[PDB]
Structures are given as structure tokens and as C-alpha cells.
Subunit: 413 residues, 2 copies
């Protein structure tokens, strides 16, 4: 067979909810998840707010003893992963363990436990660093832990491509299923970089919004007053499955993965091609992969991180990739307006969002879009959700630091 | 079906700063393990490491630019430029979009992470470098090299601890075969020999503590082994679609014919006692390549010099290759000389594996004075070994968490 790949399970922790359903309901209602940071002293930090996961309870998934061996990014990823597996109804036994794998990464990994470990080294010396330091912090250990907990013995990988992480893991999980390495994969990304070193690091690059007096208004993609991105935490995970295998068990199929495209800006360490041409290359490759034209794409969940340079360039890329006719019929929005930029989880969370839009024939809004840049030639779904009619394909973009770009195209099922 | 070949190689390792120098050294059984002198190792339980010697960034970039990059990135860039130049690949406007990068790291920029955190803690948030993020995160070898060389094809970074370098090469090959690119620069780099890195692996007790004889510490399969020896470096390959390479006159070292992956699903730090995870990855690679055990002349093992690890791998190799295959095969761990290069282990060892096909010569497992009894395999103790009509060789990397990979290369 030419092996097709479908989404049969989804799982999510985000600043606007701790399940896919809660998050999606909140997004359709235009709710922000951005709040002040309470868990450390933000006093001389130029940005003091972030998109935080609320009320996270790890004990729902694992013991406090086990959780102590894991940074929160790993706990978040495990939680969304368990959600996704249970949602899929996939059964894992000795017969098929070797055919079920994991592709889950993080952009930065366990910053909090990194900070804690370095503190211990510096205050108490080398012999007082936790024995779990390495496995608690390194980016591949979401995939490691979840495979161990669930007996997943298929391909085990972790892509770490900054803001594109979540998208690339899903894309390559699909590639591996299609190639024959596995019949299912648990795939995505997680991040918890809202720590002192993380906020200072992105602060020092002056990448973040500094609208500290109005956190919920800080993230405003394409708005004339945008001043950098809002950092958020979370996890997004999909169970992907070979189509015949899913059909044969009569699985609920949320969507089909039909295109995955990748490119590099090759421009600058932190700003995008002013062209938007890198983004366009990834979208164009995804479209060719899926065999679709611009008119067939009803929705693009943009990267749209609320940066001056970034937001505008993406619109140029989208127009180039979709063409004139495609551009006229398409809706584009950035849910980062509500969630913030989830970094390693951005791409997987947004892929889930993109799939839900196909499922409900409904597109979430770009909130805070009060005064758009002049001369963008696209409907950016400002303020309020929008219903769509017969949308068969939707696209998710993630365009990260170093110029690493990816797009996924999902098809309605 | 689009075939994939190796047309450029680049390397920084504890035994040399080019592929040729490293290979010559490995064939001569030379160790690159040395005492750490760049920070005070007084209270550290392990005080030695495989270090890159005499690294000079200036032949690739200014001190001003290097300042925006942890050494792991500088190492990766260096091996990447070597590889590109070795390949003779021409990058212009017409083909930039078809040439990509797949390069990762296991841990990334620990030194600049430590430095940044120190600044934050001593001097506050406004004193953290503006380059903190791009200087430390694991995807920025691929980012920086793409920028420096105008590479606009797929840009990824796999970070799978010890299997990183292998997985990046494998997936770069997958992407070429699939049609996403006509060439890829692929591999891994690491420079984790820092205070936090040595303390971190020290606290897990994963390291040899033979501080009195650093060059004897790494002794895969030897009865006295007591954990791995950490090493730094970078290994990079230029991969390219076969027709594209032939059409331009490229020198072709070898063909990538098999890539297999699995997960132990067993424990966060020790392997399936079976070795069955490793076997699954080897078996998948063999099926991908369409070969039997007897067709594999050489396995460059993971063999990190851990008590649990080394033995389990031999079980996996015997299972994957079968009895007849096992009888005709040679197996060695070059980590006996280089140490465990973490994110670079797999890509450096893939280069080694290719060179063994090119020269019909297998490097030794040094320090193998007293092997575990009842391994049923030739582990090439002490001295290099010549081979006859070896058409395929296999490279394994089996990392923390149970993430496994194997690559099979074919002689041209």
C-alpha cells in the first residue's frame, strides 16, 4: 500500500485549558490565558507575565515520587500523551508494542531543574547535584518516559527545533508511519520555559512584549501596537495511526495528515526573511506533498507571534503560497493572541487546533486585533470566531529561531 | 526509489580534527582521553574526558560571531564546513531550497547556560547576554550553518541523547529519499565537558572514576569497566540523492541503505537486559536495507563501557545477525579511544563505519584485556583488523531512555 496517516487521539495542556475540549471551547470564546508570573520575583525582569498552565495535577498520571525525577516540561508532555492515548482507544500489548512509537520533543527542556542543579553545584558542590539531573532535564525524556510508562517499543525520537518542535515531531511521526517503521505514533511537544533564566534569556534578546500593565492585551498579532511575543507553557500531543489499521478497528478519525513541508530562511539567527519566502517554501512543499492548491485551504493557523518583523512577513508568505484566488477564500488567525507562544508546544497545540477547526467547521479568532497594519490583503478573523462551509483542508504554520520552518496540512475526515 | 549516498564528511574528535587524522589515530589504537584542565576538578568524582585539542574557530568565523555561540555550535559548524568543502557541493540560488540541514545535540550549550544563570543570579536579569537563547539551544547548529551557507531546504535538529547523531543522518536520508531535498548536511555535536555536565553525569554515577589512568578508563566489555567516559566533538555527513551526485561528478564514499529505530520501553537509564530493543532497531535497519546477518561485516557498536549496557548489546547483535552472521562479523567500540561523544557519538561513528567500508579495515576495541566470559563475538581487541569483501557495515547508538538506532551503509 501507499500508507495514509490519520489522527485518532489528541491531548493538550495550555494556558486556556487542560484538555483539548476545554482549550478549544475557550479559544472559540476568545479567552486569554495570559497572567502575571507569581511563582518567582519578577522585579527587574523586563517582562513579568506569561501563559501559564493552571491547576496542573501530576498525580492524575503518576506518583509524586516519580514526578520528582522529571522537570515540569516532561510532566506536561506525559500528561498530554496519556490523554491522547486514552482518547485514541488504542490497545498496546506484546503483539504490537514494537509497532507503536513516540516522537516528542521540547525546544529548551528542563530549565527549572537546570537552574536548580546549577545552584546546587555552585552552593553545595558537584556531589550534591541530583542523580536525576540529566534524565530530568534533557529534551528527549518526554519520549523516553512515555515509552517506558506505556510499553511503546516502536521508533523513539525527539525533534528539538525551537518554535517548530511540535509541528516537526508530528510531521516526522507521520513520515515514519507512512514509510512502514510503525503503525502508530504518539507525537508532539511540550515546554515549561517560564522560569527565571527563560524569562531573562528571551528578555535580554528583547523578543518579548513588555506590556506588563495589560498582560491579556500584550499578544496582538498584526496589530499596529504589537511589541514582541508572549511566552507560554504547555503540551500538545497527537496519536497518529496508519489508516487501514484505524479503519479496521473502526477508530474515530479526527483528520488525515496529508502534507508536511519544511524549509530554512537562511537569513538571520532571530528575524525572518523580510520576503516571507522561507515560510512560503515550507507551505508550498506541504501543498505539493498533499496535492492541493491554495483554494482548497480554508484555514491557516499562523505562526503569528506578535512581532513587528515576523507577523507581516508571514502574510507575504501565505499570499505567495496560496495564490490570489486561494488568498481570497482563506481565513487566517493566530491563537497565540490567546495562548501566547508555547515554544516547543506551539506547533503541536496549534496542529490540534487546526484539526478541531476541520472537525467543527469553525475557526478561532485573532483577539486584540484592534488596529491592523494597513494593506494586508487577508481576513485575519479579528475578535470573534468564524464559521466555515465545506472546509476540506486546513494548514498549520510554525516558523522558529534560526529560520527553521514547517507547515502541516490536515484533511477533513 | 531515490537512493542516498555520502559525498562529504567532517569531524572534530578527541583523537583528531579531521576525518583523516581521526581515522588514522583510531586504526593505531590511540586514546584521546585526557585530564580536564579548564576548570577546577578538585571535588569531582570524574576528572577526565575526551577533549577536542587545539580547536581554532577563526578559520570559520570571527571572535565577535563565535561569542554568540556555545562551543557545541562552533564544533558543529566546523565539522559541517569541513563536510561541505569535502563534498564540493555548489550552493546557488537555483538549488538552495533543495539543500537542507539535520543536525542536533544531546544537551546543547551547557557552558553558556551556566554562565547565563550565574549572571542572572549575581547581577540580575539585565546582565544575561542578549544571545543567551540562540547561543545555547540545540537547534542552532542547524540554524547557524544554514544561515552561513545559504541552505534553504528542510532544517531540523533531532535531539535524542546518545543517538542524536545517528538519527539526524538517518532522517536526513529519509527526507532526501522522500523528495524533500536533494542534499542534506547532517549529524551532531556536543561539548558537555563542563562543570554542570561532569557533575550531572557524576551524580547519576554513569561515569568511570578511573582518575589515575584516564586512557584505560574506557574499556567496553572488559571485566573491570566502571561506566562511560565523556567526550566532546562533532561528526557531520553531506548526504545526497544518488543521481544528483553522479551527475555532478561527486566522490561517493558509500550509500546509506538501512535505517532502523526502536525503543527499549524499559528504564530511564539501563537497557533491556535482553538487548531486545537494540535488536529491534538492527532488525529494522536490516529489513530496510534488504540484507541478512552474513552480509554485515562490521558493527560499530554503541559499547559505552557500562556494566549493564555492553553485555546486553552483544545479545542484541547476536539475535539480529543470527548464528552464521555472528560467526563472520567483527564488532568494536571506538568509544574505547574517543569516549562517548553523546550527541556526536552516532555521527562520528557513522563516519568511522563508512571509512571501514572504504579501507576494508576495522578499528579495534582498545583496553579489552579481560573480556566477559561467553560473549560469542570477535570484539577486535587491541589492534585493527583487515577485512575481505565487506559490502555492508552497521553503526549502532542506543541512548538514555531506551531510544535506539542503527544505520547500515553499503560499499560502492
Amino acid at each position: 500500500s501507499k500508507r495514509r496517516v490519520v489522527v485518532t487521539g489528541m491531548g493538550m495542556l495550555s494556558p486556556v485549558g487542560n484538555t483539548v475540549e476545554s482549550s478549544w471551547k475557550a479559544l472559540l470564546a476568545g479567552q486569554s490565558g495570559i497572567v502575571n508570573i507569581e511563582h518567582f520575583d519578577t522585579t527587574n525582569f523586563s517582562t513579568r507575565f506569561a501563559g501559564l498552565v493552571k491547576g496542573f495535577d501530576c498525580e492524575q498520571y503518576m506518583s509524586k515520587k516519580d514526578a520528582r525525577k522529571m522537570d515540569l516540561f516532561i510532566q506536561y508532555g506525559i500528561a498530554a500523551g496519556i490523554q491522547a492515548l486514552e482518547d485514541s482507544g488504542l490497545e498496546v500489548n506484546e503483539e504490537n508494542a514494537a509497532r507503536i512509537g513516540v516522537a516528542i520533543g521540547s525546544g529548551i527542556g528542563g530549565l527549572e531543574l537546570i537552574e536548580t542543579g546549577h545552584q546546587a553545584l555552585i552552593e553545595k558542590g558537584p556531589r550534591k547535584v541530583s542523580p536525576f539531573f540529566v534524565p530530568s532535564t534533557i529534551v528527549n525524556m518526554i519520549a523516553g518516559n512515555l515509552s517506558i510508562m506505556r510499553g511503546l517499543r516502536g521508533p523513539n525520537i525527539a525533534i528539538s527545533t525551537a518554535c517548530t518542535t511540535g509541528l516537526h515531531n508530528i510531521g516526522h511521526a507521520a513520515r515514519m508511519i507512512a514509510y512502514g517503521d510503525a503503525d502508530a505514533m504518539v507525537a508532539g511537544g511540550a515546554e515549561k520555559a517560564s522560569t527565571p533564566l527563560g524569562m531573562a534569556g528571551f528578555g535580554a534578546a528583547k523578543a518579548l512584549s513588555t506590556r506588563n500593565d495589560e498582560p491579556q492585551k500584550a499578544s496582538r498579532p498584526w496589530d499596529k501596537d504589537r511589541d514582541g511575543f508572549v511566552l507560554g507553557d504547555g503540551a500538545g500531543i497527537m496519536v497518529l495511526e496508519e489508516y487501514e489499521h484505524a479503519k479496521a478497528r473502526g477508530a474515530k478519525i479526527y483528520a488525515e495528515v496529508v502534507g508536511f513541508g519544511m524549509s530554512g530562511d537562511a537569513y538571520h539567527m532571530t528575524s525572518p526573511s523580510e520576503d516571507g519566502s522561507g515560510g512560503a517554501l515550507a507551505m508550498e512543499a506541504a501543498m505539493r506533498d498533499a496535492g492541493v492548491t491554495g483554494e482548497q485551504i480554508g484555514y491557516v493557523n499562523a505562526h503569528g507571534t506578535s512581532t513587528p518583523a515576523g507577523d507581516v512577513a508571514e502574510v507575504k508568505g501565505i499570499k505567495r503560497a496560496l495564490g490570489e484566488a486561494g488568498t481570497k477564500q482563506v481565513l487566517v488567525s493566530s491563537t497565540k493572541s490567546m495562548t501566547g507562544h508555547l515554544l516547543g508546544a506551539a506547533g503541536s497545540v496549534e496542529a490540534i487546533i487546526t484539526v478541531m477547526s476541520l472537525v467543527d467547521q469553525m475557526v478561532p479568532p485573532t483577539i486584540n486585533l484592534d488596529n491592523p497594519e494597513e494593506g494586508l490583503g487577508v481576513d485575519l478573523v479579528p475578535h470573534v470566531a468564524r464559521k466555515v462551509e465545506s472546509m476540506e483542508y486546513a494548514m498549520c504554520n510554525s516558523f522558529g529561531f534560526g529560520g527553521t520552518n514547517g507547515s502541516l496540512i490536515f484533511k477533513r475526515m
